[PDB]
Design a protein around this nucleic acid. Structure first.
Lengths: 86, 91, 90, 74, 107, 71, 81
RNA sequence: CAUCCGGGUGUUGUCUCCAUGAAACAGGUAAAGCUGUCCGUUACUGUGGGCUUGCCAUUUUUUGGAAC
């Protein structure tokens, strides 16, 4: 029961290899699912098994069924709005 | 330390821009406002600020169902670097 | 009003300025202070904007600009495009 | 694990795809060199607009602020 | 380096074109290390097609009017100002005069 | 630092960039205003049917936070 | 410089923010920072379209602030001397 | 309650010593460093002096989520 620094939470994503979903900065229409495997002081993140998930315009749900595989990507931290587990 | 940037400009990505400057060949610069600049780089810095000669600026307007290819000539120009998207070597 | 060609912002304290912002509005008021970020303090500031209904008149004239009286106002420097002198100090 | 700068330094002389923030434009080509700021230089690079190839470009430089992600290509 | 070169364009008739499309013609009186530019006897202009595309350039035309220099109701949007100070981040390009000996300034 | 001490372990609603809203228990923060949320939920409109539970840990990047409201 | 000192001198007065999103918050300034991060209390929020909502507290990231209107009695605070 | 031996400050005059590009002429004022008038210097660049203490592209400002 303490302050958890955001960088240490990203490191917990890295260490426990927990899949994450990433909300992009101004692209409200797509998100990225994958596993974080490295980062830096700017929140640039290297993601393993990246898949680009379309987001329904009206419902707001994630269309996992037609997501696009990408592989290992370096998602530039200036493009990240939110990183969440599962 | 200036001897550091001397190396990053000889061996990092901006080496391409440096070769363009040294060999005086033109380059094609894509800008954030959808304009293309075909010009000779006279000077540059780490921001991709550039001083250019023989600038030829190309862009396309839209008037509904048709487009017009506009074009300009500038003898010499300063370009602020944050507008640069891609600098392409002319083959 | 005509001002000296060597004038910097440091000289324009107590002058009335029109300060133009990136969203299309203008702020008119006596400059009290400025900052390295170009943050500005305008005393007795008024904001003017051109409503979208009246914007068609500006295309290739009398424009009915909407005003808000703000008072003492801090403008954040990143929002500023440019500044113009309107009037000299008293 | 692999941090962003070592990962991108390991992609040198390999094919990468540089998706951009804007215009749905992705450049696919062999990564030549990289800056601390993640400016990029590609040889043999070629432009894709909305998944449609626009022909090869050659040797290009991409300024760091235009890049969305750099993906390794198989 | 290159802004320290722009510091040498004093008293030359630059044209500064901003990122919103507004074009500023005038005598360059001073430049900051951050490219904040001070100009006198300025003539603000907007390209004619910019004015026609009202939706995409309404902010630029509104600002050009709200500078207060748009006295004549001419066929083109023109503003006349004795003095203007431009925040440097908004500058996109600067046309330099042809006679300028760049080799002597870039040292 | 952002003086967010007041908000720790309380519920907050963050208005983030892109007209998005996220509610969660503030688990911690950063010089950049990055925040960690417990029990995070995406907010879409008024109807709870359109709200979506996010996950156990959610990190929000500080420049994406427009504002936050105490709850 | 002075604009940030003026904002820290507005602490405890009613101030009105407008944001880059266009929203307006009027409330009592609780705290301020060199970033212009501000906390407001007992706040009236005007949506850009005209909707009015009341909130007990709001924290606003300083980068998202467009301008801050402070009381005019600050015009002769010692910081300007 | 007085006297007496002394003291400070301000203003004006006087006395001594030393000085004396413009001290002419006219008005005004208690008087003048007031007005007409006269003399020199200065505006641009260089060097020097004084001040600021800026330099000493990575999330909150200025090296662009913009453009359509």
């Amino acid at each position: 029961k303490a302050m958890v620094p955001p960088i240490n939470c990203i490191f917990n994503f890295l260490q426990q290899q927990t899949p994450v979903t990433i909300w992009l900065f101004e692209q409200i229409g797509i998100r990225i699912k994958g596993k974080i495997v490295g980062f830096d002081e700017f929140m640039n993140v290297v993601i393993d098994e990246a898949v680009e998930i379309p987001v329904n315009s009206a419902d707001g749900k994630e269309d996992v069924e037609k997501g696009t595989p990408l592989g290992k990507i370096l998602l530039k931290g200036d493009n990240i709005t939110l990183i969440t587990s599962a | 330390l200036e001897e550091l940037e001397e190396f990053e400009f000889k061996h990092g990505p901006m080496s391409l821009i440096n070769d363009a400057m040294v060999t005086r060949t033109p380059v094609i610069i894509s800008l954030r406002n959808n304009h293309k600049i075909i010009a000779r780089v006279k000077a540059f810095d780490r921001h991709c600020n550039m001083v250019l000669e023989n600038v030829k600026e190309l862009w396309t307007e839209k008037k509904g169902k048709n487009v017009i290819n506009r074009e300009r000539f500038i003898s010499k120009l300063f370009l602020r670097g944050d507008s640069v998207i891609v600098v392409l070597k002319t083959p | 009003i005509q001002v000296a060609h060597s004038s910097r912002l440091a000289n324009l304290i107590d002058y009335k300025l029109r300060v133009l912002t990136q969203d299309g509005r203008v702020y008119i008021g006596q400059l009290m202070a400025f900052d390295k970020h170009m943050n500005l303090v305008l005393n007795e500031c008024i904001e003017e904007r051109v409503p979208k209904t009246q914007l068609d008149k500006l295309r290739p004239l009398n424009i009915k600009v909407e005003k808000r009286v703000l008072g003492l106002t801090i403008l954040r420097g990143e929002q500023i495009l440019s500044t113009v002198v309107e009037d000299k100090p008293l | 694990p692999v941090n962003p700068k070592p990962f991108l330094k390991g992609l040198v002389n390999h094919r990468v795809g540089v998706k951009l923030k804007f215009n749905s434009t992705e450049y696919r080509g062999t990564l030549v060199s990289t800056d601390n700021y993640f400016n990029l230089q590609l040889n043999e690079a070629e432009e894709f607009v909305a998944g449609v190839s626009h022909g090869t470009l050659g040797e290009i430089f991409i300024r760091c602020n235009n890049v969305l992600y750099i993906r390794e290509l198989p | 380096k290159l802004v320290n070169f722009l510091k040498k364009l004093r008293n030359e008739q630059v044209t500064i074109e901003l990122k919103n499309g507004t074009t500023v013609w005038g005598t360059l009186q001073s430049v900051s290390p951050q490219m904040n530019a001070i100009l006198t006897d300025v003539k603000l202009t907007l390209p004619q097609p910019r004015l026609n595309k009202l939706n995409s350039n309404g902010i630029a035309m509104a600002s050009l009017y709200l500078t207060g220099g748009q006295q004549p109701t001419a066929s083109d949007n023109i503003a006349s100002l004795q003095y203007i100070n431009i925040r440097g981040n908004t500058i996109r390009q600067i046309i330099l005069p042809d006679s300028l000996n760049l080799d002597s300034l870039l040292v | 630092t952002p003086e967010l001490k007041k908000y720790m372990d309380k519920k907050i609603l963050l208005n983030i960039n892109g007209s998005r809203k996220v509610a969660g228990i503030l688990r911690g923060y950063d010089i950049f205003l990055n925040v960690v949320l417990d029990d995070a939920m995406e907010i879409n409109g008024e109807d709870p049917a359109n709200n979506h539970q996010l996950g156990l840990q959610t990190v929000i990047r500080g420049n994406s936070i427009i504002s936050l409201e105490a709850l | 410089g002075i604009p940030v000192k003026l904002l820290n001198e507005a602490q405890g007065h009613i101030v009105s923010l407008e944001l880059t999103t266009g929203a307006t918050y009027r409330g009592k300034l609780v705290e301020s920072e060199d970033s212009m991060n501000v906390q407001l209390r007992d706040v009236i929020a005007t949506e850009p379209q005209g909707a009015v909502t009341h909130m007990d507290q709001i924290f606003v990231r300083g980068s998202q602030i467009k301008f801050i209107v402070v009381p005019d009695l600050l015009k002769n605070a010692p910081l300007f001397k």
